[model samples]
Structures are given as structure tokens and as C-alpha cells.
Target: DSLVFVQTDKSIYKPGQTVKFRVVSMDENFHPLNELIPLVYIQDPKGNRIAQWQSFQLEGGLKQFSFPLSSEPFQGSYKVVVQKKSGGRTEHPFTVEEFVLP
Candidate 1:
């Protein structure tokens, strides 16, 4: 699959909050194509991969994946990456909201 889409609730979020990431696979007809496994990633503001979340068959296919902010307090931009598990390499990126913590 060459085309993918990532959906998120907001572009900004607070530390310790949960963000929803949705992965959708578009077929040749632009329809959702179910997959067996999916790869997810959480990257910090500096474009560094901080964590990887692997979704099993039970969690695949046009599903929502949620991740909580770091407990250490991150107050910058961040991203969510979704991709396929097989040899077919495709990626969808999303931006998390920017916020400040007291």
C-alpha cells in the first residue's frame, strides 16, 4: 500500500494526556483495506522515534490507537507514525498539539 492516512483528535495536547491515533489503509479505489498487523510510532518534537507500538491482528484495520504523554512532561511538538508490518513500506504521519505545563 502506497497511500495511507492518519487521523488524530487535536494537534496539541497536555502532558500525561491521551491522544488517539487512527490508521486507515486506502486501496486502489481509495477504500479501507484491512490488514493483519500494523506498526505505530511516537516521535518527539525533534523527529526522534521515542516509542514503538505494535498492533496485532486483533488491533488492526481502521482502528484507533491511543498513547499517553510522557510522565516527564513534554511541552513541544510531537508526531504519530503508522505503517504496515509486511514488506510493503508505507507511512502516515500526524502532529500532536503543543501545550505548556505548569
Candidate 2:
């Protein structure tokens, strides 16, 4: 099966912070797959899409997405969805909440 891996720079995020993520497509041998991703996006905890890209190509098998969080974002689990094909789905999870940095 064709595989796509997704990740976020960090797992936990505070409000007003920028979240960065990346995507990499590969085959069984772990070689990069230079293919076009049909759809990719950031989804909020409320199940609303925050941002998306259409027909995006993973140039050299890698792509990056970054966006700043609103100061009043919902505190819960967020996810990044990567769709390799019409019926294929792979998601990376993250969290957003209030935290004090000592």
C-alpha cells in the first residue's frame, strides 16, 4: 500500500503560537514518492477545517505547512489530515491548551 507520513514540529501548543507541520510520501522501501496530494489541511478540535491546500504536490516528497493559532482557540485535540487519494486517509494528531512556561 502507498504510504504517507505526517508530523508536527511539536505536540503541544499554546494560544498565539505558530504551529508547523510536514508531510512525506514514500513507498514500501522508504523511498520518496513524488506525487501530488489531492487534499491536505488543518482541522480544529471542533471538527472545522482551519486551512487547506488543493492538488498540492509534495515536491521532492516533502512539504511544509505553518499557521499561527488564534489567541482564543478551542482547547482540545487538533489534527492534520493528509489525503493521498480519493478514499485514502492519514492523520496526525496534536493538542492545544493553556500552559505556563516556567
Candidate 3:
């Protein structure tokens, strides 16, 4: 019963903003499996891997990452997919608004 999910500090971000998020893994009994350090990725709307995470057990049951975004992103959803095994299914989606600093 492996379930992975991400909790973002932001669901919508503007250009020049940093995307920050935390990944957590859980089991069927709703317990955190802090020992599981799964592979994760940040994908663009075009389904391209834009950013990735390094290897480490999700410390304290959580793993965090952040990156800056340029102006006018892909105009749709951004995806974060987590997997512990090949062909596993665990993904979350968020968006970026097309806005820049004044």
C-alpha cells in the first residue's frame, strides 16, 4: 500500500517565482513511510522532465524542492509524478499563471 503525494507551498505561481513543494509517502494505514525515498520529477505541460530530485530518503517523512520559473510558462498544468517502482502510478498537478513582476 504505497501512496505518494506532494504538498505544495503554492498551487499557482507567477513568473520569476520559485516553485516549492514537499513530497510525502504513506502506507494503507495512513502512516507516513519516512523510509521511502522515491524518485520524483517536475514536468512541463508538454510532459517533459524539467526538474528532478536527488537520492535521499524523504527525510522526516518529507522531501522538499524549489526552482524558479521564467515568464510565460506552458499555459497549462504542471505535473509532479512520484514512483517507487517502474510503471507505478502517483502524480499531482498544479498550475502557473502567466504573470511577471511589475
Candidate 4:
């Protein structure tokens, strides 16, 4: 079974704007399970972490994550990284998505 990724929007708002990210996981049988997933990290193009949100639970067999940008306008490219933990080990190299804030 492979993991699936989904986003509410392709582009996020500039600083002072609100944004949210939604993701889901499924097994070979396509069964939905609400489990503890890894944290989602975000880094600016300059390799600076702009946001870091930790572990979250996907209730109702669906995981919905939300993040808010700073009030100060940000100008640059940003990347989002999501990972999962198993057997006391964290598996990184998760899906990476990039976006720019106007």
C-alpha cells in the first residue's frame, strides 16, 4: 500500500493570510484508518524553517492539518515536508511540495 497526499489549495496566501493542508493514508485494501502520523515541516527557499507543526491524529479515518503564516508578508519559495513514524523510527523523505506567497 502506498501513501496518498492531497492539498486544499495549490497556492497559499501571503503573510497575514491563512492556509490549511489536508492529507490521507490508505492501505492496499483502501481501508481508512485514523492513526498517529508524523509531523509536517515547512522550509523557505533559503533553507530556513518558516513553520514546523508536530504530530497529529487523523480522526474519523481522515487527517486534516492546518497552518497559519506569519502576519508579516513573506516573499520567497517554500517547501512542505511530511513524514511518518514506524517501529520507533521516523521515515523522512516524505512528499515535498513547493509554493510561493504573493
Candidate 5:
């Protein structure tokens, strides 16, 4: 079996901000996985897919995907999900909010 892990640059983001993340695939022994990721997507707090990548192969067992937030976006938790060709699924969660610096 293979494993996929998604990592987001930050845990909380403001509207109009950019979200950056990376996807990594590996085996139980910790070696990298080189194969088609099959599906990768960003889901909003309401279960809508805001962005997606389809049928892409990983480079060196690693890949990067990013999306820009709208000036007005849903305020809550968001997720990045990955579906491996080998039938494994994984996801990472983050948050979106409107805030001001004191």
C-alpha cells in the first residue's frame, strides 16, 4: 500500500489571500512514490470543489498545487484531498477567515 500526505503552508488564511500546498507520496518503508496521482482537489467549507488537478503524475514523488482565495470567500474550514492511482486517499485541512491586525 501507498500513502499520500498533503501539507498546507499555513493553517489560517484571510480573504484575498493565496493558499499554497504540497503533495507527497511514499511507501510504508518511507521511499517516495512515482505514479499518477489521479485526482487532487480543493474543497470549500461547504463541500464544494473550488479547484482541482486531474490525472497528473508526481515529479520525484512530490508535487505542488495552489489556489488564490476570492476577495469574499466562505469563512470556515477548507480541505485539500488527494486520490492515488493505487486506491489510497488522503486529505489536509485548513481554515479561512476575515481578520484584522491589532
Candidate 6:
């Protein structure tokens, strides 16, 4: 089996902040193959997919995917998933809040 790592800039954000994700993949021997077009998915708190297979660009063996949280972003737990074409998969969970600003 292969291995993929999904990472976000932060675990918490406001409704209008941008959520950035970085993905890195490796084979059994930890060989870097960052050229692979990542299969990414973003799910909102309600288990609803907000973005599916989001387009990204790879730089220096690092694949990145980012989304600007709308002012009216669905506030709650959010998750980002990264999967290989025929290999490994990984996910990261985050949060968005608009309940208070004090």
C-alpha cells in the first residue's frame, strides 16, 4: 500500500478566511511522486460535499489545494480528503466559526 499526507494551514478559521491544503504522496519506500494529480474532496459539517476533485497545482513535490471560505460559509466541522488514482488516501478535518467575534 501507498501513503499520502493531507495538511491544512490551520485547524480553525473564520467564515471569510481561506483554507489551504497541501498534499504529499510517497510509495512504500518513501519515494516522492508529487506529480500525481490529486483527487481531493471537501466536505462540510453536514457530511455534504462542498467541493469535489478540486483542481490544484504542484510545486516542488508539493500539491496544493485552497478554497476561500465565503462570508456565508456553512459554519461547522469541515474535512478535506486526498486520494491517489489507484493508491493511497488521506483526510484532514477542520473547523469554521461565525458564532462570535469578540
Instruction: Judging by lDDT, tell me the better candidate of 1 and 5.
Output: 5
Q: Considering TM-score, which of the candidate structures 1 and 4 is the better prediction for this target?
A: 1
Ten contiguous residues minimizing lDDT sum, candidate 3: 81-90
Candidate 4 residue-wise lDDT, 29-77, digit = tens: 8777676666666666567766776778767656665566666534555
| Reference-based lDDT, residue 60, model 1 | 36
- Report the alpha-carbon TM-score of model 6 versus the true structure: 0.79
Residue range 1-102, candidate 1, lDDT tens digits: 444667778766666678777766656876666665557777887778777768644233477777777666455667666666655544544454444543
TM-scores for every candidate against the unseen true structure: 0.66, 0.90, 0.79, 0.63, 0.90, 0.79
Q: Poorest 10 consecutive residues of model 5 by lDDT?
A: 93-102
Predicted candidate 5 versus true structure: per-residue lDDT over 1-102, tens digit per residue: 677899999999999999999999888888888767889999999999999999988889889888999999998999999998768789899999876554
Q: lDDT per model, in order?
A: 0.64, 0.89, 0.75, 0.57, 0.90, 0.78
How well is each residue in 1-102 modelled by candidate 6, as lDDT tens digits?
546678899999897898988887666777876556547888998898877764454456577778888998888899998777665667799999868657
lDDT against true structure, model 4: 0.57
List, residue by residue over 1-102, the lDDT tens digit for candidate 2: 567889999999999999999988988888888878888899999899998888888877889989899999998999999888746899999999985564
RMSD of each: 3.5, 1.9, 2.7, 5.4, 1.7, 2.5
* lDDT ranking from best candidate downward: 5, 2, 6, 3, 1, 4
Worst 10 residues of 2 by lDDT: 93-102
TM-score of 3: 0.79
Q: How well does candidate 2 match the true structure in TM-score terms? A: 0.90
Best by lDDT: 5
